[PDB]
Amino acid sequence: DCSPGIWQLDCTHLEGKVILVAVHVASGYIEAEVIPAETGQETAYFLLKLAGRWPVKTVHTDNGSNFTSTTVKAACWWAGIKQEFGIPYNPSMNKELKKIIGQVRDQAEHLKTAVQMAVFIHNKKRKGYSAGERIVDIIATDIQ
Amino acid sequence: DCSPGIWQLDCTHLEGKVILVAVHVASGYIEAEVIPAETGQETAYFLLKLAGRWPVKTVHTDNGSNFTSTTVKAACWWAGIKQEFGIPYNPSMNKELKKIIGQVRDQAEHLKTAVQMAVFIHNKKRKGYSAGERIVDIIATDIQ
Numbered sequence: 001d002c003s004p005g006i007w008q009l010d011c012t013h014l015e016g017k018v019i020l021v022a023v024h025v026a027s028g029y030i031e032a033e034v035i036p037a038e039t040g041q042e043t044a045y046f047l048l049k050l051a052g053r054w055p056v057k058t059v060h061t062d063n064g065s066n067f068t069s070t071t072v073k074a075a076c077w078w079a080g081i082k083q084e085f086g087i088p089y090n091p092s093m094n095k096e097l098k099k100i101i102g103q104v105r106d107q108a109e110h111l112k113t114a115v116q117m118a119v120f121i122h123n124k125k126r127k128g129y130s131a132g133e134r135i136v137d138i139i140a141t142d143i144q
Numbered sequence: 145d146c147s148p149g150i151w152q153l154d155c156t157h158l159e160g161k162v163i164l165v166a167v168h169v170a171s172g173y174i175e176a177e178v179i180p181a182e183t184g185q186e187t188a189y190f191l192l193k194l195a196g197r198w199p200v201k202t203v204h205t206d207n208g209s210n211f212t213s214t215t216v217k218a219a220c221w222w223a224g225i226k227q228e229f230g231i232p233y234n235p236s237m238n239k240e241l242k243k244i245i246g247q248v249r250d251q252a253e254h255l256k257t258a259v260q261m262a263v264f265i266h267n268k269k270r271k272g273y274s275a276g277e278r279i280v281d282i283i284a285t286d287i288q
């Protein structure tokens with residue numbers, strides 16, 4: 001898609017651990033972190049964090065059941081987030097992110113650290129703005 | 145101060161818990177979270193997260209010993225962060241943030257949740273842009 005308030009939220013798996021990945025669809029900018037379990041409370045808390053940092057209007061996911069828990073619904077309610085309906089499911093940051101994590105994996109002991117390193121690398125890599133520059137440009141324009 | 149890459153990082157205490165608070169000095173925009181202990185590894189991990197999300201050039205603090213641990217130094221090294229020298233120590237988001245947390249405290253069970261709610265409220269409150277609008281404007285301008 002490409003509206004500036006649209007984000008996509010999914011979980012991946014690596015080293016037996018769960019990584020929550022959010023993508024700002026218009027820019028390719030990512031936020032990701034290892035979470036202790038793939039549960040509604042983790043997703044809800046992550047969304048509240050995300051929404052305080054960026055103007056999150058709608059969220060999409062590739063696993064719709066992710067958004068059925070009462071706790072997640074309460075988080076979208078409180079932050080005024082709606083579900084996104086304009087992106088069809090047609091069955092990949094996850095693998096690109098995983099590629100980077102593999103590249104920097106030995107630079108740190110804990111997977112959670114490597115994930116943040118990969119997020120950093122991803123957001124700053126120019127390809128010609130970087131995703132990090134694109135998101136702030138997109139958002140600022142949309143404000144003014 | 146007011147250069148766009150300057151952040152300030154401090155910890156506060158509430159309900160026997162530790163809250164790490166980072167302020168983008170130019171805008172007043174905040175990121176904050178409860179951390180399990182006031183240690184170097186927590187600070188280092190937080191800085192890496194922060195640096196992947198915003199262009200962090202220099203960091204200041206009101207407790208200089210916060211930045212003496214080897215792990216913190218390694219995080220600033222990896223992310224290319226330097227210590228800020230242009231802000232003198234003259235002995236307050238912490239209390240403003242605490243005010244908001246008090247106001248929304250019953251809206252959630254866990255302090256960590258209320259903290260994210262307070263961060264959200266703080267960043268979006270207009271007073272006339274909001275801190276959230278100011279930071280992206282400041283950064284985007286500085287890019288172009």
Ligand SMILES: CCC[C@H](C(=O)O)c1c(C)nc2ccc(Cl)cc2c1-c1ccccc1
Nearest residue numbers: 108109110113185188189214215218219222
């Ligand atoms: C971020 C904190 C955890 C991190 C890790 O690897 O997951 C870590 C740990 C556990 N311990 C350390 C001890 C010494 C040094 Cl220099 C660095 C580190 C680093 C480090 C590795 C890369 C960059 C910064 C710190």
Ligand SMILES: CCC[C@H](C(=O)O)c1c(C)nc2ccc(Cl)cc2c1-c1ccccc1
Nearest residue numbers: 041044045070071074075078252253254257
């Ligand atoms: C964010 C997850 C933890 C949060 C809390 O309070 O710290 C929480 C928990 C533990 N349990 C819940 C059960 C039901 C509902 Cl509707 C909401 C929640 C909420 C909630 C409260 C406010 C906003 C969203 C969820």
Ligand SMILES: [Ca+2]
Nearest residue numbers: 068069070071
């Ligand atoms: Ca329930």
Ligand SMILES: [Ca+2]
Nearest residue numbers: 212213214215
């Ligand atoms: Ca040491």
